[PDB]
Amino acid sequence: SGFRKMAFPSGKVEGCMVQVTCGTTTLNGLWLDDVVYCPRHVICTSEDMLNPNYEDLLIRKSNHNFLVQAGNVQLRVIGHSMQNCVLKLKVDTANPKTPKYKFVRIQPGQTFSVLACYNGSPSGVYQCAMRPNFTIKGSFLNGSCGSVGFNIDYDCVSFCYMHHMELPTGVHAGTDLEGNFYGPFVDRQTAQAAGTDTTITVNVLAWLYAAVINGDRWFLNRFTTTLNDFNLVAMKYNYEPLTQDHVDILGPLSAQTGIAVLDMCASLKELLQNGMNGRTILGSALLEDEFTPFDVVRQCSGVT
Amino acid sequence: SGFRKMAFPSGKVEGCMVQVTCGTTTLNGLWLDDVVYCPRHVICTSEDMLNPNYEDLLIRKSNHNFLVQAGNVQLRVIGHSMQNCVLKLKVDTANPKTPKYKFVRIQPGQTFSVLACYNGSPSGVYQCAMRPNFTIKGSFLNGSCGSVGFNIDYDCVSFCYMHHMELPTGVHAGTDLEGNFYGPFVDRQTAQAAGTDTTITVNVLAWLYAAVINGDRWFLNRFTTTLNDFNLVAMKYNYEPLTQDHVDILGPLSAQTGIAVLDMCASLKELLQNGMNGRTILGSALLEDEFTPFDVVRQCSGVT
Ligand SMILES: CCC(=O)Nc1ccc(N(Cc2ccsc2)C(=O)Cn2nnc3ccccc32)cc1
Ligand SMILES: CCC(=O)Nc1ccc(N(Cc2ccsc2)C(=O)Cn2nnc3ccccc32)cc1
């Protein structure tokens, strides 16, 4: 028992982190097979960051201008190309530590682990969720760009995020591993504000089921609701509207606990309307939304 | 910017996890050099768990009775011994993935990362603190025993915890890597209740400094206090008494923010007396105590 914000073991990703330097800018790269993936803003100087023309900037760059170091050894760059907001540096050596991997573009509300890196070296790992406004509430400092987000299915690593920027609001924006930004963000040092950050309702319900499985039951009530009634309350509290797809994914949790999804929604409704009244759920005084129903099942069963 | 409950990269520990089986019981082992460390209750059956005589139980066991598997390959056991509550299985092969390592016994209030494992395979990593009552609020299921807690200083892994049991209260108890339990716990399935869990005051203050560094300043007030006045309030709220040693370790955080330690204590005092009033600090509606001053400095500077 016990419930924790758990990240995937980072080992398979640690073996992929390299340092990429272009001129005087150093950031992280992801070495998979014979390709190193990194944010394209590695080619930028502080002046050409206000409004950079990456195609024009990359013209003045050659393979020898990109320094790729894996631990203490230098990789030889034999090709370079830009795919959306990422640079792909072809190296002459395949990474011997390349795990089985995939590049996936995650949906908002889905969770992933981030291996924060500096100078190609890992500093820490934590669990994140892609917010409905397509930002992540991470922990990144200057030099962390190129750090990646990922999920792991037994031996396969699904890379889903590459860190590119911090918005003036302290939230983080980045791309998938094809260089496409999540959300409307551009790799330009300009006014970019995030949209309304809504709560991921299906994840809060999954976390309420995790609380029941782990002994925290005070919030269970004698009531039920309907999807339409619940959604009127979810709208009022800037919670994502709950759909039948969401009810369906909560099915295994509903079956494990014997608490119908709509009954759990009525518990959530009362918690939204009345608050926690100074109480806690799974050691938290707020409703946690960064655990998906899959995460709750995984942690509560022991998938390695 | 941003503040997260970050764990150390688990890679160096993943390469040490093995599966240990004795009869019909399987748990995790830690392979370092030519020794495999695991909880001694691996030799127990469900009957000899109510009151086990481990010396008598281990007499009926030979080197060949301990099955050690590293991934898909079997290790040959050439020696076995009991050191306090751990078994040390000498194997004929040194772990090629053995990192630079130390065995340390941590102090209550100190933090560490746990790599939760099942059948010698890692499932996840999370950050923990050794509670003042010597328990950890982890996330462990049956089969997780032998999972380890650790800290990392650049390339050196300091192992500090090995998981042994879950108390009836859902909290976790375990040993250091010499087999000595943290706290008064015994490896026996008996009534063992934890003492009062107090809040780690120095860690809450460190987390308030992290909130200031990251923009959350609403809680800063126009007041100050003394160590004796603050401690009268800390006693009332079952917070650990703050000492000059604690003030000293908060020095670098106090210097970074320019907020005197006693002024921050007065902010904490008002937060304890008045509560959060529906507000949050670093995305939390309660006072977080599982970040030490070292953790805050590390995360807010980027130590890899
Ligand atoms: C020498 C060249 C140079 O100064 N480059 C540079 C690169 C990226 C950034 N930006 C903004 C931006 C502008 C275009 S693309 C991204 C970040 O947000 C980088 N970043 N990412 N996470 C951060 C966390 C803290 C501080 C900075 C952070 C700032 C400067
Ligand atoms: C076949 C032999 C057998 O049944 N062994 C066994 C081993 C350990 C436990 N105990 C209690 C205990 C008694 C003596 S030493 C520890 C746990 O708390 C194991 N444990 N650790 N974390 C857990 C989390 C969930 C369930 C059980 C957990 C229970 C059973």
Please give the full DSSP string across A12-55, using - where no structure is assigned: HHHTTEEEEEETTEEEEEEEETTEEEEEGGGG--SGGGSS--HH
Query: Which residues, 6+ apart, have CB-to-CB distance to A225 below 8 Å?
Result: A233, A262, A265, A266, A269
Closest CA to A26 of A69, A59, A57: A69
A206: Cα within 13 Å, side-chain hemisphere: 30
Considering the domain architecture, whether residues A114 and A209 belong to the same structural domain is answered as no
- Distance, CA of B295 to CA of B110 (rounded, Å): 10
On the CB side of B172, CA atoms within 13 Å amount to 28
Ligand 1 pocket residues where CB is under 6 Å: A 25, 41, 44-46, 49, 140-142, 144-145, 164-166, 187-189; B 1
Residue whose entry in the numeric block shows the structure tokens 């406004």: A133
**Rounded distance between C-alpha atoms, residue A125 and residue A127, angstroms:** 7
Which residues 169-198 on chain B approach chain A with CB closer than 8 angstroms? Answer: 170-172
* Same domain, yes or no: B69 and B4: no
Residue that is last in its domain, among B68, B99, B130: B99
CATH of the domain at A231: 1.10.1840.10
Q: A228 — phi, psi (to 5°)?
A: -65, -40
Do A83 and A179 touch, CB atoms closer than 8 A?
Answer: yes
Domain co-membership, B7 together with B124: yes
Supply angle C-alpha A80, A86, A90, rounded to 5.
Answer: 30
CA distance A140 to A133: 19
Q: Does B123 sit within 8 Å of A1, measured CB to CB?
A: no
What is the rounded distance in angstroms from the CA atom of residue A208 to the CA atom of residue A110? Answer: 17
Query: Looking at the structure, do residues B162 and B213 belong to the same domain, yes or no?
Result: no
d(CA B99, CA B152): 10
Q: Are residues A297 and A206 in the same domain?
A: yes
**For residues B99 and B103, what is the distance between their CA atoms, to the nearest angstrom?**
12
Domain identity same for A210 and A189:
no
- Considering Cα of A52, then A53, then A55, then A57, what sign does the dihedral take? negative
* Shortest Cα distance, chain A CAs vs residue B11, angstroms: 4
The C-alpha angle A41, A46, A47, rounded to 5 degrees, equals: 110
Q: Which residues are within 8 A (CB) of A209 and not within 5 positions of it... i.e. 6 or more apart?
A: A250, A253, A254, A256, A257, A259, A264, A293, A296
Contact B302 A144 (CB under 8 A): yes
**CATH of residue A72:** 2.40.10.10
Q: Which residue of A has its CA nearest to B124?
A: A8
- Domain ranges, residue B75: 15-99
Final residue in a domain of this structure, among B99, B120, B146? B99
Q: Tell me: do B8 and B108 sit in the same domain.
A: yes
Name the method of structure determination: X-ray
CA–CA separation, A290 and A271 (whole Å) = 18
What residues contact residue A69 under an 8 Å CB cut-off, 6+ apart?
Answer: A18, A19, A21, A75, A120
User: What is the tally of structural domains in chain A?
Assistant: 3
* Cα–Cα dist B234/B236, whole Å: 6
Resolution in Å, one decimal, please: 1.7
Contacts of A283 in chain B (CB under 8 A): 137
Q: Which of left, alpha, beta for B146 (phi over 0: left; psi -120 to 50: alpha)?
A: left
Q: Tell me: do B205 and B167 sit in the same domain.
A: no
How far is the C-alpha of B111 from the C-alpha of A47, rounded, in Å? 42
Kindly tell me the burial class for residue B262, based on how many C-beta atoms sit within 10 Å of its own C-beta (0-12, 13-18, 19 or more). Answer: middle
Q: Are A30 and A18 in contact (CB under 8 A)?
A: yes
For A232, the enclosing helix (H) or strand (E) is helix A227-236
Give the atom of ligand 2 at the shortest distance from the alpha carbon of B140: 24
Q: Is A11 on the interface with B (CB under 8 A)?
A: yes
* CB contacts, 8 Å: B126 with chain A: 4-7
Q: How many helices (H) does chain B have, and how many strands (E)? A: 8, 13
Q: Of A160, A177, A197, at which residue does a domain stop?
A: A197
Q: How far is CA A62 from CA A36, A187, B133, in A?
A: 15, 21, 60
Catalytic residue among B16, B38, B85, B145: B145
Same domain (yes/no): B224, B165: no
Decide: helix, strand or coil at residue B265.
helix
**Paired tokens of A144:** 């962390």
Q: Are residues A22 and A93 in the same domain?
A: yes
DSSP designation for B51: S
Q: Are B20 and B36 in contact (CB under 8 A)?
A: yes
Among the partner residues A15, A124, A139, nearest to B8 by beta-carbon distance: A124
Cα distances (angstroms) measured from residue A205 to each of A28, A214, B170: 36, 14, 22
What is the enclosing helix (H) or strand (E) of B127?
Answer: strand B121-129
Q: Do A283 and B137 touch (CB under 8 A)?
A: yes
In the block, tokens 């390469």 appear at: B15
Q: Residue B22 pairs with which residues in a beta bridge?
A: B25, B66
Instruction: Round to whole Å and give the CA distance between A236 and A209.
Output: 23
In terms of Cβ atoms closer than 10 Å to its own Cβ (0-12, 13-18, 19+), residue A15 is: middle
Q: How far is CA A190 from the centre of its chain?
A: 23
Listed by number, the residues of chain B in 242-281 with a beta carbon closer than 8 Å to a beta carbon of chain A are 275-276, 278, 280
Cα–Cα distance between A7 and A177 in angstroms, integer?
A: 20
CA distance B247 to chain A (A): 26
Residue pair B242/B227 in contact (Cβ under 8 Å)? The answer is: yes
Answer yes or no: do B104 and B79 share one domain.
no
Do B278 and B224 share a structural domain? Answer: yes
* Residue A275 Cα distances to A234, A253, B285, B293, angstroms: 14, 23, 12, 32
